[PDB]
Structure formats: structure tokens, C-alpha cells
Amino acid sequence: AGAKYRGEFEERLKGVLNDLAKQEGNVILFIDALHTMVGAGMDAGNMLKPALARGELHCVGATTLDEYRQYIEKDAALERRFQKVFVAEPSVEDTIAILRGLKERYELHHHVQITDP
Amino acid sequence: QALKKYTIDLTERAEQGKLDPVIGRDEEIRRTIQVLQRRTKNNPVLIGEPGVGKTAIVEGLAQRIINGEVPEGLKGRRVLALDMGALVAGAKYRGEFEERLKGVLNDLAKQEGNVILFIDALHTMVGAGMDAGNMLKPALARGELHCVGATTLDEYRQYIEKDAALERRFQKVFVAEPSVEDTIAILRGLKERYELHHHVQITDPAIVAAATLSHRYIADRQLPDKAIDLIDEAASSIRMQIDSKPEELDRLDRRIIQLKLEQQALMLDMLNEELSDKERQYSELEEEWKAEKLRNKVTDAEIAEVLARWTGIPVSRMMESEREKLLRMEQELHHRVIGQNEAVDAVSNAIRRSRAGLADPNRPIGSFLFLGPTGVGKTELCKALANFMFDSDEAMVRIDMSEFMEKHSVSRLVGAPPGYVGYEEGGYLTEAVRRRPYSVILLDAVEKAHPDVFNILLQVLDDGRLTDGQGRTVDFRNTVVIMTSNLGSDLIQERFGELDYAHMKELVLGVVSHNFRPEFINRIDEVVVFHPLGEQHIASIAQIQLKRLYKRLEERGYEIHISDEALKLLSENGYDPVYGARPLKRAIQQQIENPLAQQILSGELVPGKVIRLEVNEDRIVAVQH
Amino acid sequence: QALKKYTIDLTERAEQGKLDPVIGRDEEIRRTIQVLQRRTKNNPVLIGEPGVGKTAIVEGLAQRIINGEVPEGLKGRRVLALDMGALVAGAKYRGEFEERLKGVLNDLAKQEGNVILFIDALHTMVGAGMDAGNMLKPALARGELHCVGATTLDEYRQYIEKDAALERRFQKVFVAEPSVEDTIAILRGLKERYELHHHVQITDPAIVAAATLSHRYIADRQLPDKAIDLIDEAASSIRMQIDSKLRNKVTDAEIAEVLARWESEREKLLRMEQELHHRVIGQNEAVDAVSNAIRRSRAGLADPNRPIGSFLFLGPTGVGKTELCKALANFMFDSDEAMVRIDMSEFMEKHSVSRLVGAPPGYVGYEEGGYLTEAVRRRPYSVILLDAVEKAHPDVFNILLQVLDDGRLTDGQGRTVDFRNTVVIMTSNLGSDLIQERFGELDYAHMKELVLGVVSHNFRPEFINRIDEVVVFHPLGEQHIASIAQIQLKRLYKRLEERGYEIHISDEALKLLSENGYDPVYGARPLKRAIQQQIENPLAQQILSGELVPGKVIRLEVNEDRIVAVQH
Amino acid sequence: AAAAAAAAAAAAAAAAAAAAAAAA
Ligand SMILES: Nc1ncnc2c1ncn2[C@@H]1O[C@H](COP(=O)(O)OP(=O)(O)OP(O)(O)=S)[C@@H](O)[C@H]1O
Ligand SMILES: Nc1ncnc2c1ncn2[C@@H]1O[C@H](COP(=O)(O)OP(=O)(O)OP(O)(O)=S)[C@@H](O)[C@H]1O
Ligand SMILES: Nc1ncnc2c1ncn2[C@@H]1O[C@H](COP(=O)(O)OP(=O)(O)OP(O)(O)=S)[C@@H](O)[C@H]1O
């Protein structure tokens, strides 16, 4: 949003990557939609692939198995920095517990009450 | 500002009352409001297959904001239809579009959640020219936007539901195609609006007939748009009839100016009686127009006239010319196919049932299987039907079912599945019927086909619809699916003597049961069974062929009289009960057309005189006197 | 640099020594030196399944360069590696693959041929929309390219052996999957790096246990990839167990835990009689015979070109013959789903054989395939079931002799269908009344010998020569089939307890259920369908009326001739 | 003052292949 030059957004990306190298492993990063970083539009995924294959990246991905299988596993260095860390669907009871975690949130927003049955 | 320039309010025009009445949609407006004040995944988006009133729902939303039937949390709200192209039309420099978008975002934040944003056709603003969608996406992912979308499910799938980063900011507000009674109510309110437009009168049985006819026939567009288009074109028709004169005087006006131009082009006739009779008829109808001093309401018959001149199905009033032409349709099928009573009976009764409205609206009109040996006129009857109904032999879907002898020329008659070589050219059958829903489909010689083409014909003669490879569906239910065959030729030529029609039909029906699929024969409308021709039938056919031979040489500049003995020579030389009426045509071709053209290209025969085709001993001789 | 866009220097980290100390695969490195030291056609390709350490082959070559272990033509080189997955994924329109490609070619022309490139997935180079064969094939023939190819033989001959001009430059180097002991040697070469990383120790018996169990149980990823994965994740689990709130050595117990989650083999083979009586009552001698045959197959004395066991089955059908095959498939290999029920009642012709083995090409059932061999090819560890083998055409027995002799069978499509991992079950009922009417107090062995002589007069002697043992399948009494009906009631109560109903039964009701469809002529499944159709249909009729409540005790009390359900 | 460049827009198509069969 704050960038409009081909070499200012990339300048920001390079500077943040040099700062990630500067922080020396204390930063453990997260970036969802890694396939979107592969196809954002030098695209940013192949720009961070040196930070993959230079021993500096502590980032975490998040996507569907289709994009991980096609846009990541079929690539080589993008394969050998990751695993098939599968997010499971929770149980119904776990879902009810999480609903109990945020029942009061929705109730205090909408000024209503929520029955546990 | 910026909103005063690059947006268009709707609530002002609804406050000015310029927008149309919106009737019904109570559940849809209610769930629109429910999603609209939802905390997370805030922004609704309408999903509606094209026409079902997505824009009408947002117009009715703004009308209820002015009517104050919204809850108290939604009063004072404004709906600003973001004009996609009006942003673009000045952004000649770099990023000025992005400046306009960011400024619109800043002023919408300055309105502080008191303005609902309406973005029609959200799939246009998936990428609206990094460029637009990812710029709104942080303002999406802060809860600080009241965006409202409306797009057809194809585009919401293939442009929006692909991007899983966007589905967590929208909501399938799925509009459905309305029912016919909802369509009745919508048309009553819009009847009030359109009678205020045209200064005409629209009847309520014409409303319910427009709804039922629009649902039954035009299978392409979706409700309630097509009913509105029927009503509106009919209103234009009635106002034009009020304006100049009724259309029968306009028929005669264009006819007499046609014959005026062609009479001036003639400065042999076939012309005098037509022009005199239609000048008389124009004078009589101008007198009747003065005497009634007309149409000034909208009946359902006007709706039928608009629907007929739009699709092509004759739904209109059965005028006297149609009744006369229909009892003459029995008479004229015997004028061109002489003999073979049962076929003319079957097809005549089928088209009479179809014009009387008694046809089952879930099948095609009448689906005939023709039997009988070669050249008792099977294809001649089908050509007679198309040349009655459309007044051309080749105005028909001829499907030569002996080209489909592979399993996989169903690709020809239906279409290519997607991505393959000729995909965007449909089939022959499916395309040529979706162009013209009322036409006669001749599947010529069905028994030569590969037997899993009868699957396609099972679906056709089952329900009159078919799923071509481009995904769509065809409305076959105004077509006549005539097939031909000869699968009992030895048997019919054997036992047409000493057996009545029921036993003949049942026996050859058993033979056909051995040939076809037993699933398929019961699904047929009617299996008519033919018979070889007798010598007087062949004499009649010889007279018809001699009529067209006289017409061929009347073009050239010659006239023929025939003798009376020579027709017996044709009737005996060109005769056997085994190969139909074609040895007659070969015998005519040889025993007349060879010496005649032989002597004309000699220069022996002379124009202007009479070619009296008299007899030799066992030949046919031409003379000139 | 554009080298700082898509290339990876491995001489960089190898000069630093910061890569894998690659041990093994010396001969493949040697043949890479053979191809790279030619004058022309200097682009070797590596062939094997993905995950065989081809990147490690290139890195070990780089380490031999840094160590000076190469001849004097390979020195000063720079190991590079080009992406084949970003030159197309970035390529929007005409000439963005080719633009980057020519930019790479000219910037390597600046490098003056002192550069070795790696490329994986040589099949990807052929099809990308033309693309790169027409632009690298000159450099393939110019010799200025020093590529290192890497793909698999099947994609190689599908895409790349089409164009022989692309084929003539690259030189095939087969890199197979390493053995378990080669995996041991590599991991012993790499146990030091692991133990210097996590500051722990590693049990080498757990290493060889991990290698053996990874070779046996899991075939998703292969050696050496799966061993690295299992060792590193087990070391991570041990590291969390240390840093949770105690051993540094990773044990084989954690290996088996991550194995099954993320040993019951040998004595389960030894206790196979108990295994067959885990679900099947009766047929004790047949159980003993099957278990002895299984153990003799696992004894490892028979022909390594012959299957597990040749069998012919006789007796009254439906009594548990198929049920024996199901439990046999369960406690043999996996479960009740590796089996193919085949009726030999159909096959009585020559086109019967053309159906069951495979059609010749150009004919009706060709890529529809053989009825047997395709199902064998899908499930290579199953149990083959045959039904009414006396109803077969006689030439099918030639195919059966090929099964029991060679353990393999060329189908109609022309390939090898191995049979040394399945069980041939062939069922018949020729000596039915010989066993049924003489079930009383006659032994297993002499009844077997008598019906053996009978079937010897029936079938071919050379056919039953190959059969190891024909079990009798004596008709089970009312107590065994009543117990089977009780087990069906137990699994019925299990499914209704999944629905959630406390259900009891009368013992007279149990006797009437056992006497519904008992028949020595047909099998146990008449009793099954009888009890099923009697109980199930009025049950839900009572349920969806709104009568039954989950938690109510449901005693299956008797009527005068029926069974009524109560709600107490 | 940028001008929107007209593109090249590479496309794609496919093609099936039948197979007859003898019927012995
Ligand atoms: N419930 C309704 N009440 C009144 N008029 C309606 C109703 N539904 C549809 N209409 C009319 O039919 C038109 C079709 O509505 P639209 O939402 O425009 O259809 P559409 O598929 O969205 O076409 P677009 O996408 O707006 S260009 C409306 O503009 C109204 O004129
Ligand atoms: N009743 C009839 N009236 C006029 N022409 C007829 C009649 N019966 C037969 N014909 C002749 O039929 C010839 C061929 O027409 P077709 O309908 O194709 O023949 P058909 O015997 O109906 O069967 P097929 O299968 O088409 S060969 C024409 O050239 C006509 O001369
Ligand atoms: N001899 C060896 N010495 C040390 N590590 C080895 C050896 N052989 C293989 N490896 C390792 O085994 C792993 C295999 O990974 P890859 O090199 O990616 O396999 P590959 O053969 O290149 O196939 P793909 O398609 O790239 S997964 C790597 O971590 C290598 O370091």
C-alpha cells in the first residue's frame, strides 16, 4: 500500500530480509499463503528463496494442500525447507470449547446472550 | 470532494422516487440486513443468475432506507454506487487512479460507517485495472468497509472463490430465480409503472399469461426479466397501433407499396389480381378503421403475438387462414405425397393437437418412426412437412443418420466437450435447434446408426432436452422429431396383402423390437407402417413428376403435351412392387429425357411450338408442329 | 547479478565446508567426471526416483573440488543450479521464459565456461507451453553449457526420448535408491552433524531399526529421505522431552511411535491359530493347516519363484469360507479389503480367458484389461479368491499352472504380474455330501484323503499336484453357527450403541434367531439375512413413530412366534 | 503519463484421439 515503484517495494523487501538476517534467529516469522508469495507480482517468493537456502529463515507458511503440493513440493529448494505440517479439523467438542472462548466476545458486541444448549 | 464526483448515490434517486417498485424479496432483504450488521466477515455479496434482481434488491434496500423500514442502526445510511469506469476516465498519469481510490477510501472513512458502499459486479473489481482488489483488501481486513457486491455465480466462483484470501471477507447471499407468482406480483407493480409510461392499459389475465408463457417457452433467459420484456414490447406494440393504424392496414400498405415499386420496375404478370384485390382490401379495411373510430388495451393475445414474433413458435391467435390452411394441410399433404394415408393422418393430427394446445409440454411435439420399403416416400413426406410448415424443402434439421456409424460422431451431432479442437462451434442438432426452437428434425435412416446414439434420442424423446458439451441445455419441446427406416421390407412387401393394418403393425413392430432398443421403441410417439405403391399411385406420381418436367422446360422455352397411351408405357415399363416409385423416375428419365435432350442439343426441336410426346410401338416419340 | 537472481553457488558453502559431508555414491560422481571431461556433449543427466540425493551428488562433487579430489580440468569451477519452476511461473506472456533464459545464457557467456550448472526435472524443460530445447540444444551442442540434469526414467522416455536430438546430448546416469546398509553408512557419516546440532547422542541400534522399519512399513518417501526425516523428527521429539520441564539418545521406541502414529509381526505369525480363532469359531483343523502353511511360507525354505501357498477349498459354501478369506487377509497383510472375489462359473470359453487374463491389442477388452491381473496389479499384497473352479474352461488351468509354477503371468497388455505375494484360494463344492452326510465321527485326515481321491477323479492330477493342502471345511454344528449369530448380534448392538440404545435379549429369542435361517445346504448368510430382515424392519418402524428413547433398556422379549421390543 | 501496452496473450488448445476395436 505504501509502495508504487519497482524498486521501492523490492527495496522494502530487501531491507526487511537484511533485518531478519540481522536479528540472528530471535525472530521466528509467519507468512500465510506462501503460494501467493510465489505469485504476487522478481516475485517475492523467489526473492525469499535465498533466505530459505542461506540458513536464515525462521518463517512459517499456511495454505491448502493443493498449493503446497503444486506450487511448493514441485519446486526443489522450496520443498526442502518445509514439511507436510497438516492442520486438522477439530472436534465438535473442541469447537464448543472455542465457542465458549468467544461467546462473551459476541455477546458484549451485539448486546445479546447466547444459550449453551 | 471525491464522493461528490466519483460515486453515484442511489438513496437520493430513491428519495426522488426515480427508482422502480421492488416487490417481495423479504427474506432476501432480511438476510441482506443480517449479513450487513455482522461483525466479522462483514461485507455481503449478492449471488444471482443473470436477471433475478440483484440490483433490484439493492434499489429496494435504498427505498426501504428512505421508507425507514430498516432498523434504527441503519437509519441515515447512504448507498453510493461506486462507478468503476468513472474512476478510470481521467487517470492519464501514474497512479492517479490509485490516488482516486485512496481518496474515496479516506472520505468513506470520514463518513465513519454511516455510508454503505455498493459495488455492482464485484468480479470486475477482482482486478479493475496491485491495481484495485489488493488495494481494497486491507480496508476489507479491518472491518471498516460496508461493501456490497452482486455477481453471477459463475464469476463469484471463477474469480472470487478461487482466491481463498477473499472468501473470509464475503458471504454467499444467494438470490434464487423467482417463482411465477412472485413474478405476478412484480409485474403488477411494474404494470402500474409501465401504464404510467406508455399511457396504455394492461390486463391482469395478460399478466398471468405472460408469466406462464414466458416460463414455458423461452428456456434461455431467466425470470422475471423475460416477463417484463414481454409486457414492455407489447406495450410498445399497442402504443404504435394507437399511433399510426392497426397492423393489417400496415400489411396492406407495405404490400401495395411493394407492388407499386415492382410495377414501376416493369416499365407474364401474376400481378394484376393480387394488386387489384389488395387495393380493394385496403379500401375496405380503411373504411372499417374509419367505422370503428382499433386496439387500446393489452390482452394476453398481444402477449402471444410478441412471444411468437420473438421465438418463432406459433403461440398467436389461430386466425381463419390457419384453420383453412390446416384442413388444407391434410389436403396438401395428399397433394404432394399421394397415397400412404396413415402417415398423413398421424402427422396432421399431431400438428393439430399442437396448435390446439393439447400437446404435452414435457415432450417434443410428435416423434415419428417411419417404416416401409424404399421410395414409398419417406423423405418425401418429411420434405412435404417442412415445405408446408416453413415453405421450403430445406428448411429443416436434416440429420443423415448413416454418417454416424461410428460410436463417436455423437460429437458431431451434439458438440465437442470443452478444451478440445472445435469446442466453440456446438453441435449441428443442438445449435440449429437452439437457434430456432420450432423446426422439424429429420433423422434420416436411423437404423444405420451406431446403437449408442439411441441414448441421445432417448433423452430427446424422453423429455425434449439435451445436454450438449458446452454445458447448456436445449429446449426440444417445440420440435417434430421424425425418423425413417425400412426394417421390415421383405415382411411388409410380403404380407401387405391378406393382412390388416393392426397385424402388419404388430408384426413389423416385433421385428423392430429385435432391431432397436426395447427401451427406445416405447418412448416413441407413433410408429406408422407403410406399404408399397399400386400402379395408379405410380400413375399419380408420374403425373406429378411430369408437372415438374413441364416446369423445367417451361423455364427453358419449350412446351410439352403428352399423349395418353405413353403414360401407360411409363406405368408398365417403370413398374415393380419391390423398389418403390423410383423405377418410374428412372423410366421417365430414360424414355423421355434422353431422346428429348438428345434432340434439343441436336437443334432439331424448336421453341415456341408444342412438343407432343406421342407413342412409338414400344418407345416414346417427340414431334414438332 | 542475474546470478544473484536464480542461481545457487555450492562452491561457496563447500569452500566454507557448510554443506553435507556426502559419503557414498562414488561411482556416479565418477561417471559425472567422465561426461564432464569430454570435449563435447558435456551435460550429464541423473536418473532415479525423487529423493535419492542427486543434489548431494552435486554437492559431494563440489566438495571433491574444494578438497582437490578431482582431476585438473574441473578446478576453478562454480557449481550453479537453475530453477525450472520460476522461469515458467513468472512467465505471463510471450517471451518471459525466453527473456530470462537468454539473459542467463549471456551472463554465463560472461562467465566464460568456468561454471557448472545443475538442473532438476529435465521433463519440465521440454513442455512449458518452443521453450528451451530450441535454445539450450545449441548450448547442449556448443559445449559451453555444463549442465547437470536430474529426472526420472519414466518422464525421460515419455517427454525427452520423443525428440532424439535432445536425447543425444544428455548422458544417462542411473541413481537408484540406496540400500538399508548404504543408508546406515550415510547416517553414520551424518550422525556427527546431528549430534553436534542438537547437542545429544544417537543410538545406532535405533538407527538401524529406523532404517529397517522405514524400509518395511512406509513407501511414500524413500531412502535416504525418509531416514533423515524420521531421525530428525524423533530427535526433535527427544529434544522437547528434554526441554519440556530423560535421555539424549534417541531410542527405537520413539522410532516405532512416530512410525505407527505419524512391533507385532513375528509372534503374530507364531500365534496364527489364535489369530484365525480371533473371529472365526470352528474349523480347528483347517485353522491349524492354514497357520502351518503360513508359517512354512514364512519359514523361507520353498521356491523364490513360487507363491505363498497353493490351495483348493471344498465343502458346503457360505458357512465361513469367504469369512475365512476375509480374516486371512486381515491378519495376513492388512484388513478385510485386499481380496478379489471371482466366480469361475462364468468362464467356460476361449474369450473367457481373453476376459480374465487380458485381451490382445486391437480387441474388445484391452485397456479395460484382464479381470484378474489388473486387480492384482492394483493390490500386490492380497488374497486371490476363486468360486466354483469346476465350472472353468480347461485351458484356464494352464494359466493356473503358470501361476503355481512361475508365480507370474503376462497379461494381454504385455507386462509382468507377480504372484509371489498373494494367496490362491480356489473354492469348490464337489465333495459336498461326502463331507455333509459323513460329518459324524469321521476324522479330518481320511475324509480329506477320500475327497482328495474324488477330486483326483474330477480334476487334473497335475493341477492338484501343485496344490499344497485341501482343507475339508466340515459343516459346522448348530452351536458354532449360533455363536456366529451371537457375534452378529454383538456387532449389531455395537452399531446400535453407536446410535445409543441399551438393548437386551431373551435367550428363547436367541434360540429362535439361531433357528430362523439355519441350513446345512446353503451357508451362514441365510441365517444372517433371516435375522436381519426379521429384526431391522419393524425396529425403525417402532423408532420413528416416536416410541424408543436412547437410554431405555430394550429387552428382545419373545412373542408366541415373534420377538417384541420393550422400553424399560 | 503512462500508456497501457497491448499484450501478446498466449493461448492453448487440446485434441482427443479415438480408438476403434475389432469384435471377435
Ligand atoms: N423483485 C423485483 N421487483 C421488481 N423488479 C425486479 C425484481 N427483480 C428484478 N426486477 C427487474 O429486473 C431487472 C433485473 O435486475 P438486475 O439485478 O439488474 O438483473 P442483473 O442480472 O443483475 O443484471 P445486472 O447484473 O444488474 S446488469 C431489475 O433491474 C428490475 O427492473
Ligand atoms: N406418395 C408419393 N408422392 C410423391 N413422391 C413419392 C411418393 N412416394 C414415393 N415418392 C418418390 O420417392 C422418391 C424418394 O423419396 P424418399 O422418401 O427418399 O423415398 P422413400 O421410399 O420414402 O424412402 P427412402 O429411405 O428415403 S430411399 C422421390 O423421388 C419421389 O418420386
Ligand atoms: N551420500 C550421501 N551423503 C550425505 N547425504 C546424502 C547422501 N545421499 C543423499 N543424501 C541426502 O539425502 C537427501 C535427499 O535429498 P535430495 O538431494 O533432494 O534428493 P534428490 O535425489 O535430489 O531428489 P529430489 O527430487 O531433489 S527430493 C538430502 O538431504 C541429501 O543431503
mmCIF file of N, CA, C and O in Angstrom, chain C residues 502-524:
data_model
loop_
_atom_site.group_PDB
_atom_site.id
_atom_site.type_symbol
_atom_site.label_atom_id
_atom_site.label_comp_id
_atom_site.label_asym_id
_atom_site.label_seq_id
_atom_site.Cartn_x
_atom_site.Cartn_y
_atom_site.Cartn_z
ATOM 1 N N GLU C 502 -29.556 -48.991 24.882
ATOM 2 C CA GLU C 502 -29.345 -50.111 25.793
ATOM 3 C C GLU C 502 -30.286 -51.238 25.397
ATOM 4 O O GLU C 502 -31.497 -51.150 25.615
ATOM 5 N N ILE C 503 -29.744 -52.295 24.803
ATOM 6 C CA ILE C 503 -30.555 -53.348 24.208
ATOM 7 C C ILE C 503 -30.171 -54.684 24.828
ATOM 8 O O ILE C 503 -28.989 -55.045 24.856
ATOM 9 N N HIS C 504 -31.169 -55.413 25.323
ATOM 10 C CA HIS C 504 -31.006 -56.758 25.844
ATOM 11 C C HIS C 504 -31.734 -57.742 24.934
ATOM 12 O O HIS C 504 -32.255 -57.370 23.879
ATOM 13 N N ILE C 505 -31.777 -59.008 25.348
ATOM 14 C CA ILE C 505 -32.367 -60.061 24.533
ATOM 15 C C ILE C 505 -32.829 -61.186 25.451
ATOM 16 O O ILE C 505 -32.282 -61.390 26.539
ATOM 17 N N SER C 506 -33.885 -61.879 25.034
ATOM 18 C CA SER C 506 -34.258 -63.138 25.655
ATOM 19 C C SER C 506 -33.460 -64.280 25.040
ATOM 20 O O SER C 506 -33.073 -64.236 23.869
ATOM 21 N N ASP C 507 -33.202 -65.307 25.850
ATOM 22 C CA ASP C 507 -32.458 -66.459 25.358
ATOM 23 C C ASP C 507 -33.313 -67.344 24.465
ATOM 24 O O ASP C 507 -32.789 -67.970 23.536
ATOM 25 N N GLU C 508 -34.620 -67.408 24.731
ATOM 26 C CA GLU C 508 -35.532 -68.053 23.795
ATOM 27 C C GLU C 508 -35.580 -67.291 22.478
ATOM 28 O O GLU C 508 -35.644 -67.897 21.402
ATOM 29 N N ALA C 509 -35.523 -65.958 22.550
ATOM 30 C CA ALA C 509 -35.409 -65.145 21.344
ATOM 31 C C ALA C 509 -34.109 -65.434 20.613
ATOM 32 O O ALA C 509 -34.083 -65.474 19.380
ATOM 33 N N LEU C 510 -33.029 -65.676 21.362
ATOM 34 C CA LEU C 510 -31.755 -66.054 20.755
ATOM 35 C C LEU C 510 -31.853 -67.410 20.068
ATOM 36 O O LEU C 510 -31.276 -67.610 18.993
ATOM 37 N N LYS C 511 -32.602 -68.345 20.659
ATOM 38 C CA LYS C 511 -32.774 -69.657 20.044
ATOM 39 C C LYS C 511 -33.607 -69.570 18.772
ATOM 40 O O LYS C 511 -33.287 -70.217 17.770
ATOM 41 N N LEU C 512 -34.669 -68.761 18.790
ATOM 42 C CA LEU C 512 -35.471 -68.566 17.584
ATOM 43 C C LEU C 512 -34.689 -67.836 16.496
ATOM 44 O O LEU C 512 -34.856 -68.130 15.304
ATOM 45 N N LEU C 513 -33.820 -66.894 16.885
ATOM 46 C CA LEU C 513 -32.961 -66.238 15.903
ATOM 47 C C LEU C 513 -31.960 -67.213 15.307
ATOM 48 O O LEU C 513 -31.727 -67.198 14.094
ATOM 49 N N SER C 514 -31.381 -68.086 16.138
ATOM 50 C CA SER C 514 -30.490 -69.129 15.640
ATOM 51 C C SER C 514 -31.217 -70.152 14.779
ATOM 52 O O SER C 514 -30.585 -70.793 13.934
ATOM 53 N N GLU C 515 -32.520 -70.323 14.978
ATOM 54 C CA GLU C 515 -33.298 -71.262 14.189
ATOM 55 C C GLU C 515 -34.137 -70.588 13.110
ATOM 56 O O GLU C 515 -35.049 -71.222 12.571
ATOM 57 N N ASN C 516 -33.865 -69.320 12.790
ATOM 58 C CA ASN C 516 -34.530 -68.707 11.643
ATOM 59 C C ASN C 516 -34.035 -69.297 10.329
ATOM 60 O O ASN C 516 -34.791 -69.948 9.601
ATOM 61 N N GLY C 517 -32.764 -69.083 10.013
ATOM 62 C CA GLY C 517 -32.237 -69.439 8.712
ATOM 63 C C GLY C 517 -31.073 -70.401 8.767
ATOM 64 O O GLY C 517 -30.146 -70.314 7.955
ATOM 65 N N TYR C 518 -31.104 -71.316 9.730
ATOM 66 C CA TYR C 518 -30.115 -72.383 9.773
ATOM 67 C C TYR C 518 -30.382 -73.375 8.651
ATOM 68 O O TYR C 518 -31.479 -73.932 8.550
ATOM 69 N N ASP C 519 -29.373 -73.603 7.811
ATOM 70 C CA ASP C 519 -29.490 -74.565 6.737
ATOM 71 C C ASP C 519 -28.132 -75.130 6.341
ATOM 72 O O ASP C 519 -27.228 -74.358 5.983
ATOM 73 N N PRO C 520 -27.952 -76.452 6.405
ATOM 74 C CA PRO C 520 -26.652 -77.039 6.043
ATOM 75 C C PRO C 520 -26.367 -77.044 4.550
ATOM 76 O O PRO C 520 -25.245 -77.393 4.158
ATOM 77 N N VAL C 521 -27.330 -76.679 3.709
ATOM 78 C CA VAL C 521 -27.141 -76.790 2.270
ATOM 79 C C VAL C 521 -26.671 -75.484 1.634
ATOM 80 O O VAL C 521 -26.132 -75.502 0.524
ATOM 81 N N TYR C 522 -26.863 -74.347 2.301
ATOM 82 C CA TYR C 522 -26.654 -73.051 1.667
ATOM 83 C C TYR C 522 -25.547 -72.239 2.316
ATOM 84 O O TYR C 522 -24.687 -71.699 1.608
ATOM 85 N N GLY C 523 -25.545 -72.120 3.634
ATOM 86 C CA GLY C 523 -24.486 -71.419 4.318
ATOM 87 C C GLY C 523 -25.023 -70.612 5.477
ATOM 88 O O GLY C 523 -26.186 -70.737 5.859
ATOM 89 N N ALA C 524 -24.145 -69.776 6.034
ATOM 90 C CA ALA C 524 -24.498 -68.978 7.200
ATOM 91 C C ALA C 524 -25.248 -67.710 6.822
ATOM 92 O O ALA C 524 -26.016 -67.182 7.633
#
